[PDB]
């Protein structure tokens, strides 16, 4: 009985700050603190549904208000309380509340801080009704509200045209993904004759070829997988809290959240899983490959996010939906720390964000030092931490299954690279010598930072256990396996630590570095942004003018029908009016008209 009311309030009470903002009663200053309290109180409100869940396990559907009685179709406002929904809510509110604390630290000179916090809340609503959506239309409501707000959020400072370019690029790649979303809606409404998710599961589409690939394409959009990946690394162009919240822990994982919510239908078709293993594999290799040799402080970790996304959707690839949801909570915990920690050192280091000028901050900023090391260790899978309970359990699961041959080697090799850039980011940014500008203004003693990092810090240390034990067993436990690949989830990260450490040390060895061809490949993001953002965009839009606008509309279409008939009347209307005026010529013509009438054509005859 309580379950319906408490979770619904967690949605409703999240929107009052938006309406108060429109009321303009807030006299600035207090508004960001007012927003934080609402989100924090939303989190505390969101607990008691979660503690309810493990006690019994009840999962409800809260279809409340009827929208369309569209013949046999019954569109209504429907929220599905399920394990994926009721558990992701406090995790989502936890990260967004702590970073709401962080946003005041970083942006204190921003004159539009109130608009920023309002934007953060408005996204939270659009994501909230996405994660808890029972009918597909509400999923699109979240699917599109979140994408639009990215365009507003990472395009915060309109300012530099590169920010708008990232805004146009991010929405365009997201625009490509939802083409499959619309395809799935058309297929479900036509064949399954419904849009609510649970009815589609009931009707048992045992051969859902077209809807599933469209759903896979939709996930490829928001999760920034191959084809549609480069919008994630370019999304760093906005404020770091935007990049720390939206597309590091919350938005990008929402694409993966679509496939898991459709898992009861997905596993029926064996073929649809082969590209999920295919897509997630190569994405992990490529995104980690770029992160190895990148330099921007946010580029390294942003690529790590996409590499993580490829890893977790590989799991739902090999019949591991719930384990993907297990990763959805751990990854949102420590990855926010890594971005928030980078945001902290950016602000202290006179907004400098290139590892070549970091270094020596291990002792200058110890609190951020401790957070990143144990944050990265969770990211690398330190046993009995938040990361290990998901990542290494996943590796133990994927390698032991009927899957594509090499497809188990990215998640093996990428994990080695996953640990590799973690060592590089630790070595360059914090270890080494202090290569930063001589004037030191660094400081992290503000309590707003210390509490913000600490809130997820005990999370990034102790969450792993407090989700692993309480949740009911919903996957088959891997019990008997060989020793080598059961430990390989931990071994692989060891040479990831080892080889990268030696390679990072090569910078200490005093000898010039030759530019390798493979190094050049990794520095340009693997050449994808250089080409795909130059050739296809130029050719299609050049056609929009040379062929589309100038050739057809302005020339051809307007010269075929209208101007031809205009000229046809024009061409010989001249001598229709141009007559010499001689009575001879007029009356001679009257002669011919007489003869043609009664002799040649002979109307009489």
């Amino acid at each position: 009985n309580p379950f319906a009311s408490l979770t619904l309030t967690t949605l409703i009470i999240l929107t009052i700050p938006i309406m108060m903002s429109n009321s303009n009663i807030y006299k600035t200053n207090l508004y960001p603190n007012y927003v934080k309290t609402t989100v924090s109180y939303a989190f505390t409100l969101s607990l008691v549904p979660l503690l309810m869940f493990m006690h019994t396990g009840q999962e409800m559907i809260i279809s409340n208000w009827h929208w369309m009685t569209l013949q046999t179709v019954e569109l209504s406002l429907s929220f599905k309380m399920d394990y994926f929904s009721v558990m992701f809510i406090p995790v989502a509110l936890f990260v967004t509340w702590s970073i709401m604390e962080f946003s005041m630290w970083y942006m204190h000179s921003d004159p539009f801080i109130n608009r920023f916090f309002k934007y953060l809340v408005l996204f939270l609503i659009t994501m909230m009704i996405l994660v808890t959506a029972n009918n597909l239309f509400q999923l699109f409501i979240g699917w599109e509200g979140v994408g639009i707000m990215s365009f507003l959020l990472i395009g915060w400072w309109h300012g530099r045209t590169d920010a708008n370019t990232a805004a146009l690029q991010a929405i365009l790649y997201n625009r490509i993904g939802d083409i499959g979303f619309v395809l799935s809606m058309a297929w479900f409404l036509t064949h399954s004759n419904a849009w609510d998710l649970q009815q589609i599961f009931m009707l048992n589409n045992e051969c859902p070829n077209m809807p599933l690939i469209g759903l896979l394409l939709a996930a490829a959009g928001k999760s920034a997988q191959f084809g549609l990946h480069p919008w994630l690394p370019s999304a760093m162009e906005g404020p770091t809290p935007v990049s720390a919240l939206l597309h590091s822990s919350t938005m990008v994982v929402a694409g993966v959240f679509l496939l898991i919510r459709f898992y009861p239908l997905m596993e029926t078709n064996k073929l649809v899983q082969t590209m999920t293993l295919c897509l997630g594999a190569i994405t992990t290799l490529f995104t980690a490959l770029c992160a190895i040799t990148q330099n921007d402080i946010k580029k390294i970790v942003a690529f790590s996010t996409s590499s993580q996304l490829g890893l977790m959707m590989v799991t739902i690839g090999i019949n591991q939906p719930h384990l993907a949801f297990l990763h959805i909570c751990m990854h949102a915990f420590f990855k926010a720390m890594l971005f928030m920690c980078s945001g902290s050192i950016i602000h202290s280091l006179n907004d400098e964000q290139d590892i070549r000028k970091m270094g020596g901050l291990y002792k200058a900023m110890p609190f951020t030092t401790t957070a990143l090391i144990i944050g990265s260790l969770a990211l690398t899978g330190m046993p009995y931490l938040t990361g290990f309970y998901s990542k290494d359990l996943i590796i133990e699961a994927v390698n032991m299954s009927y899957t594509n041959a090499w497809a188990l080697l990215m998640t093996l090799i990428a994990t080695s690279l996953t640990a590799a850039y973690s060592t590089r980011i630790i070595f360059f940014a914090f270890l080494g010598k202090p290569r930063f500008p001589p004037l030191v203004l660094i400081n992290e003693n503000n309590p707003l930072l210390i509490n913000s990092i600490k809130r997820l810090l005990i999370g990034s240390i102790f969450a792993g256990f407090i989700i692993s034990n309480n949740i009911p067993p919903m996957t088959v436990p891997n019990t008997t396996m060989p020793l080598y690949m059961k430990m390989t989830a931990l071994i692989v990260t060891i040479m990831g630590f080892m080889l990268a450490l030696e390679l990072n040390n090569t910078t200490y060895y005093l000898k010039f570095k030759y530019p390798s061809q493979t190094y050049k490949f990794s520095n340009m993001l693997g050449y994808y942004p250089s080409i795909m953002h130059r050739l296809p965009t130029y050719h299609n839009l050049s056609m929009s003018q040379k062929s589309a606008s100038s050739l057809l509309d302005l020339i051809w279409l307007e010269t075929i029908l209208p101007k031809t008939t205009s000229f046809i009347q024009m061409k010989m209307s001249i001598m229709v009016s141009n007559q010499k005026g001689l009575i001879k010529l007029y009356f001679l013509s009257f002669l011919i008209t007489i003869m043609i009438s009664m002799t040649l054509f002979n109307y009489h005859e």
Partner: protein, 172 residues
């Protein structure tokens, strides 16, 4: 107008070792290869022959394009930096001020009173500076974008308002 033989090598050096800093990262590593870059730069100082000197430009640039960092390092405030034209969101031109409502300009009376005086200086010095300009322009307009200074006392340097009243680099 001209990037003569002097500046070309000066710019070439600037982009050369800045890329080297992007390569060596570590200060001790950078300093060794910087002085080698410097020592190898002036080992052929006495190269009176300009044809060889222009030739020495050729082996300076083509391997610079090969040797440049594929991820070149740029400071935030300079072209390509992470903070270029970041604060244009806040830089509003000065002319928007007079549109403020009587309540809005009574909000800050002293600044508007001083702003009015600033408007005065432009008004009765404009005709002086354009006249000063005209009598010193060469025939067929100016042959160089550089502006002449204030010839005599009192008159402000010609065409001065916007370059002086330019919005601050850190407006907020």
């Amino acid at each position: 107008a001209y990037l003569t033989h002097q500046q070309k090598v000066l710019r070439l050096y600037k982009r050369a070792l800045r890329h080297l800093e992007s390569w060596c990262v570590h200060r001790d590593k950078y300093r060794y290869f910087a002085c080698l870059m410097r020592a190898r730069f002036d080992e052929h100082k006495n190269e009176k022959d300009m044809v060889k000197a222009t030739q020495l430009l050729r082996q300076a640039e083509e391997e610079f394009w090969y040797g440049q960092h594929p991820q070149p390092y740029i400071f935030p405030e300079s072209p390509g930096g992470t903070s270029y034209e970041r604060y244009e969101c806040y830089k509003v031109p000065e002319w928007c001020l007079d549109d403020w409502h009587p309540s809005e300009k009574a909000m800050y009376p002293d600044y508007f009173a001083k702003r009015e005086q600033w408007k005065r200086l432009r008004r009765e010095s404009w005709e002086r500076e354009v006249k000063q300009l005209q009598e010193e322009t060469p025939p067929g307009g100016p042959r160089t974008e550089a502006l002449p200074p204030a010839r005599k006392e009192g008159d402000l340097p010609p065409l001065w308002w916007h370059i002086v009243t330019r919005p601050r680099e850190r407006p907020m």
